[PDB]
Amino acid sequence: TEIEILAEKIARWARARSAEIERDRRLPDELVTRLREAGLLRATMPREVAAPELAPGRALRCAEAVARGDASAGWCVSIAITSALLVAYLPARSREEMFGGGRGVAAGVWAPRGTARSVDGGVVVSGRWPFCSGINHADIMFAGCFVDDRQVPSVVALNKDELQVLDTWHTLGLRGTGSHDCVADDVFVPADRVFSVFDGPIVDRPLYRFPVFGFFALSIGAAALGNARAAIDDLVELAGGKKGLGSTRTLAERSATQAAAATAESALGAARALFYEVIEAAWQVSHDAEAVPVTMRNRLRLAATHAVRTSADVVRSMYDLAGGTAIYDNAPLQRRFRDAFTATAHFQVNEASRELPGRVLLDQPADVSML
Amino acid sequence: TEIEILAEKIARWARARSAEIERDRRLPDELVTRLREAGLLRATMPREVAAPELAPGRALRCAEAVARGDASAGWCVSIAITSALLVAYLPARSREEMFGGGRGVAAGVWAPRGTARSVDGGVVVSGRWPFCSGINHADIMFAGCFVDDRQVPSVVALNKDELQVLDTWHTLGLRGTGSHDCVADDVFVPADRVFSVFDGPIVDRPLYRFPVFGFFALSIGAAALGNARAAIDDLVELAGGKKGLGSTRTLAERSATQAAAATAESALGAARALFYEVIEAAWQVSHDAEAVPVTMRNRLRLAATHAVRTSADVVRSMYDLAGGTAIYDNAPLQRRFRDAFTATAHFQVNEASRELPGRVLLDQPADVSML
Amino acid sequence: TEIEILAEKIARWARARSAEIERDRRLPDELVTRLREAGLLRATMPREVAAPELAPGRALRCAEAVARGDASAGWCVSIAITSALLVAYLPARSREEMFGGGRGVAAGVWAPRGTARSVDGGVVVSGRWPFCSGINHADIMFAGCFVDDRQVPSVVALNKDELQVLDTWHTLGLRGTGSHDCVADDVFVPADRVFSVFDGPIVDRPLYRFPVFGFFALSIGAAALGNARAAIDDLVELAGGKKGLGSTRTLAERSATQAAAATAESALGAARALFYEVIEAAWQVSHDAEAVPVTMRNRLRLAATHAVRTSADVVRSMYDLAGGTAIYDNAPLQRRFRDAFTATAHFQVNEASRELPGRVLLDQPADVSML
Amino acid sequence: TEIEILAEKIARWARARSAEIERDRRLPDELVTRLREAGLLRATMPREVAAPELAPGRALRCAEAVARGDASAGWCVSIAITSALLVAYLPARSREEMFGGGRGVAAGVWAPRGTARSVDGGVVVSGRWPFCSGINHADIMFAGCFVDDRQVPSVVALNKDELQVLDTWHTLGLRGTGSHDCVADDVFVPADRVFSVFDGPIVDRPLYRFPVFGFFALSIGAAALGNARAAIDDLVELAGGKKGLGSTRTLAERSATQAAAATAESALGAARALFYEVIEAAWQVSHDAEAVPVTMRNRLRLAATHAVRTSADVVRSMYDLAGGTAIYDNAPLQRRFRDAFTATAHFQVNEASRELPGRVLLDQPADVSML
Ligand SMILES: Cc1cc2nc3c(=O)[nH]c(=O)nc-3n(C[C@H](O)[C@H](O)[C@H](O)COP(=O)(O)O)c2cc1C
Ligand SMILES: Cc1cc2nc3c(=O)[nH]c(=O)nc-3n(C[C@H](O)[C@H](O)[C@H](O)COP(=O)(O)O)c2cc1C
Ligand SMILES: Cc1cc2nc3c(=O)[nH]c(=O)nc-3n(C[C@H](O)[C@H](O)[C@H](O)COP(=O)(O)O)c2cc1C
Ligand SMILES: Cc1cc2nc3c(=O)[nH]c(=O)nc-3n(C[C@H](O)[C@H](O)[C@H](O)COP(=O)(O)O)c2cc1C
């Protein structure tokens, strides 16, 4: 059966375990198992490592669907399928070592907080990376660093078991993502596990032509969109039956509630429609000879930021409409709200991420290397 | 050639004549002729009357494109292709009398301000209708009215001939729409020119299964969306070279301008994407045996209203960014701003039009006869 | 010596204990003692009971200043000084029994969830009331109920020790307010501990002429306004030295941060200025023969709701500006944000509370008995 | 007779003539006479020229009251009383020649668009200044320029006589302000009529210690605030009796109208309270030995910008609520809306004018010479 069908069954499992996911700040072993068996943690790795090489719009749709069940579970998918793309940047040898025959789930932090000095055979890298989503269930972490004098950063492929995982993920929401800090202490990395994203993939097929920084941003949008849909579902369910003490008209019988529901539904539908429209436009040209153009990359970053922010606006409105119900820890809207306003802090999709795409639109000078 | 190509060429003619359109509060005869030649003022009339019977997504796209050239010209298309749908509600006799062989352009006011007495072979109708967009170049006006005792309103097909057109269209914007008041003074209308929208079309093909009230609302969305895209285009052109003669930065080099352009471009792209998504979903089920369901109709009204409101927000932001430039009558953004904030007053797509679609979403009792 | 000065000092103690306040969901005994010794938990009780009978603007300024140190502690003041007004509604006998000689701290839940049936010399009452802020440190709770089958509700003064306090206050924010649910089970209340707010106070001096429902709503605004000032203070402190990449381009040096700081500072200051302006206008006419008029009462509720919502907007903007800093449990802004978005759920100051003051502004029929 | 009472009487005369003011793009001679006789066009000139030397809060209150009657007439007072301040910067001779014995009304454009070559006796200046509000009824225009090669601009006091007034004020709103372009062509100006605002006033009394750039900005705030109050007045009066055809309600009987009326009224009241709060605080320290500090100047610019932008938001909400009524030229709200969205373009109070006051709030390096 198609992976989208699988994803939508796993969403329902994630929803059933969402209290435990939050409590333990990690996915239960058997939810991870389901996710692994459906191919969703390696969906975007290349064919050579026994992986679906799933088209980006389908993969992002899967992440959105899981996020509707539970934002943290969906985010773990987003990060796993973004990190998975970097498997296509490794020389065949190290790629086969780490992900061959269906093995390897990847985490990844882009911030180049490592310092790598070169030695015979590779480099020695040290550093501390926060926000290592999914590290609890990943084998490998792709981590950013600077090698020697070099001013353009690099990526090293690290084994989790060479790293120290620090218990730092004490957060408003997205608690189940376990995005703890990781520490490398003079870890040796063979040369064939060091690469530069800017040199581009070794596996040169359309999935890896799709803008890689765009995909990362979109994956955060997929998780936020699915979370916001769940929030509208929560409010609609509550509003039919929620009755005042004094004024007995239900929540749903208030014209303001009706206006707000309509406003939120159309704002979310708009953001989601732009999201998949720009993904498909970029997927089509990822099949062409030339690099996907700056114009197209920009459209992906515009839509991803718009999706995360619109999603936060939608969840905030649903939370506010629920009033005193939602302030309590037992209320589902509470967690959607907390998760929505943790997702907005991400650097790829915050308010500041609108400015560079504005520069591109206004035909102003712009460093678009990471667009 | 495709009618969409014709539409974009007519958009550039409308743009070139936009000052005269506004000054005269009417489209120039030559623009009407071009519009008429391309089939755009009758695009959605049935095959029988020598008309394209154009699919709704294509028709609405043409209106959007003309509105990019000039909002008033685009609105005229919008109202002509919405009124044209009612040609499918006329018995074959009156239909061929008024629209046969390629003749007849329609205007239409839905507000049932007419008062109609039954007589032998028809009715005699009186009333005054405002907002008769396009009456300057229409032959026929479909007008709402109540017949005798009835609580459900009806529609009469009137010849502009029998009508007193009053000079009342002195407005902030959409001046070229000439949406004057029309008066009927004891006008006899034969019975085969009286019908009820609620009894459904006579021509029972998919274009006329498409929700007719939803089409009306969307047509205003189309005009607003096209006008908003022109406003962004105006700002981007202005900001390239506007330097405040007090600082060392053009307008385009200010971080705030960049953020605002990106916010507006993504908000518009999202509204447009939703607009055409729901039209295509409704278009598909318009081919099915059953009437298009309330759920589908609701999405069209949700997206129509979101498109007009978002469009206004977008134009307001571009107007504001342009500062002291835009306050002057010679500035293109001034007119986009005036037009955008005339379009928002329309009853199908104002803030109040969110409430009923909200009642539908919260599964509350709702009169959805005109959804 | 001046109670405003004491409020400031107690604010800084509340801030030093804010982690413990949150952890324990109650104020530490020693902070309660400070608050008691300053007169802040009884500041608005009549002078007959050895209380300051403090003017409403001074009392509300004290609540706001405590809230700046810690929102929950300030909220406790707000609810204490609002409930304390009802001491003026008790017959002199029961008033000296419960509050004589400086004794008694009051809590109060207005919702008439109680059912009371008249028996001999009084009533017996049962019910469950949520949101009993401060019950951990109050002796008396004023609880709303319906007596027999009257349609206008009454208030019973209950001893906390006759109630069952359920552990239900598990919430996004305002954790230290310990606003648990309280249950009465066939509690007997003597008749001179039963009254109706609508019959007016026994102590007929200006403080008790000041609109009582207005005071309650304003007390929520005072806590939200103080929390919001602390959020801005938190962001300004952080923004000076939050450096991005791996070196210097601080958060404070971004145009958007500057524009956002300015927007928030003027919005808060505007809300605060309207808050104290309407309090002082109402204070003056509370000295006149007639009841404070509906027009004045209305201005109080408009200002209170504006203060709470604007405060939430401010805190949300400061939280967002702080990005990945604020998602972590050790960040001050996280708690301001959680607290700000618990305060907004309160029924006196939520978005729905705009509608009735709107009806008064539009001179529409309105039931203003609880304005 | 107190000047605030004269102002509020003159407001009703301006109201009665507002159609003529807009048609002619100038105040009628009879209105100018009333204004001149009340002392409002010279209210802030020093005592030595037979002027009230009116405290700034009283002056700005008068400007706000006139703007409520008609925004353009209020704007004319705003500009006259801001320009009048510069009479305190002239040496005693030419103050006497230009303004002595109660003569002289001043206009003023701060933009240093003039180029002044020094000669014997003074300078020769040429330039073209847009936005010369009130030039139609002013005798003198203070205009910005650079003298020789200085980097700090200067001000010349020009007689309208020696200027070409060009007919360029064709604008969305504020039409009555006749803020035309003025051209100086090799105009000789005695050294006596050349000064730098930065050297400070010659008349060193509190009114001229009050921040002069702050006063200019606030004066635009006063006009925008008065205009916004009139827009709410317009709406409330319309909404009592506006019933649609099938609305089963008036506009006032809709929940959304009520909530919006209350939102707009509190937002305006908040902006107005902050406005006069910071004026009074700045007025107090204008009596102290030192210059008014930067933190105080900053608060005036914050409040000024918040007043103009909030006023625009208020007028847009009232316009939108009025729906199809307000689109027509005969609708009072239409002109309030056009005027409100003309005033927002002013450089002292646009969105960009939030950035410098943000830099002061975040204690960032800032050029505060024109704050
Ligand atoms: C819940 C959450 C999870 C995140 N996960 C990642 C991740 O797996 N990889 C990554 O490069 N960034 C992730 N980020 C964003 C990073 O915070 C970012 O690299 C950086 O620390 C932003 O802070 P700065 O202003 O100091 O540059 C995540 C953010 C959030 C809020
Ligand atoms: C109606 C109106 C009247 C104005 N009057 C004046 C004036 O009398 N003196 C002045 O220095 N600026 C005045 N301005 C300010 C200009 O509009 C504003 O500076 C301009 O939009 C910004 O120009 P810049 O980009 O070159 O800095 C006025 C603005 C408006 C909208
Ligand atoms: C943190 C918090 C504390 C509150 N404290 C009180 C209180 O001490 N007394 C009171 O009448 N309401 C208080 N409220 C308001 C009540 O929460 C509100 O009346 C109740 O939830 C409405 O319930 P309903 O929707 O079932 O009618 C508080 C609200 C919050 C969010
Ligand atoms: C520029 C403009 C053109 C319009 N044209 C039409 C039209 O051709 N047919 C129609 O039924 N409504 C049209 N409307 C909608 C009207 O705003 C609305 O039907 C009516 O004015 C108000 O009815 P009421 O009395 O119930 O408020 C138009 C609105 C605008 C702003």
Residue numbers in the entry:
A (entry chain C), B (entry chain B), C (entry chain D), D (entry chain A): 6 to 376
Give the text the authors published on this PDB structure.
Our subsequent investigation of one gene cluster (Rv3093c-Rv3095) associated with ethionamide resistance that contained a putative monooxygenase/repressor pair with some resemblance to ethA/ethR, indicates that Rv3094c is likely a flavin-dependent monooxygenase that sulfoxygenates ethionamide, and Rv3095 is its transcriptional regulator. Ethionamide is a second-line anti-tubercular drug used to treat patients infected with multi-drug-resistant or extensively drug-resistant isolates, and is a pro-drug that requires metabolic activation before it can exert its cytotoxic effects. To investigate the mechanism of ethionamide sulfoxygenation by Rv3094c, we solved protein crystal structures of apo-Rv3094c, and Rv3094c in complex with FMN (Rv3094c-FMN) and ethionamide (Rv3094c-FMN-ETH), at resolutions of 1.91 Å, 2.00 Å, and 1.64 Å, respectively. All three crystals contained one tetramer per asymmetric unit, tetramers being formed by two homodimers, the C-terminal domain primarily mediating interactions between the two monomers.
F136 is the main residue involved in FMN binding pocket formation, and its side chain swings out to create the FMN binding pocket. The FMN flavin ring of FAD is held in position by a network of hydrogen bonds (involving G113, W115, and S138) and hydrophobic interactions (involving W80, V114, F136, W174, L179, S184, T347, H351, and F352). (i) A conformational change occurs in F136 and Rv3094c binds reduced FMN. (ii) An electron from reduced FMN then transfers to oxygen, forming a hydroperoxyflavin intermediate. During this process, H351 acts as a proton donor, stabilizing the hydroperoxyflavin intermediate. As Rv3094c is co-transcribed with Rv3093c, a predicted FAD/FMN reductase, and FAD in ACAD family proteins is often reduced by an associated flavoprotein, we reasoned that Rv3093c and Rv3094c may form a two-component system in which Rv3094c is the monooxygenase partner responsible for the sulfoxygenation of ethionamide.
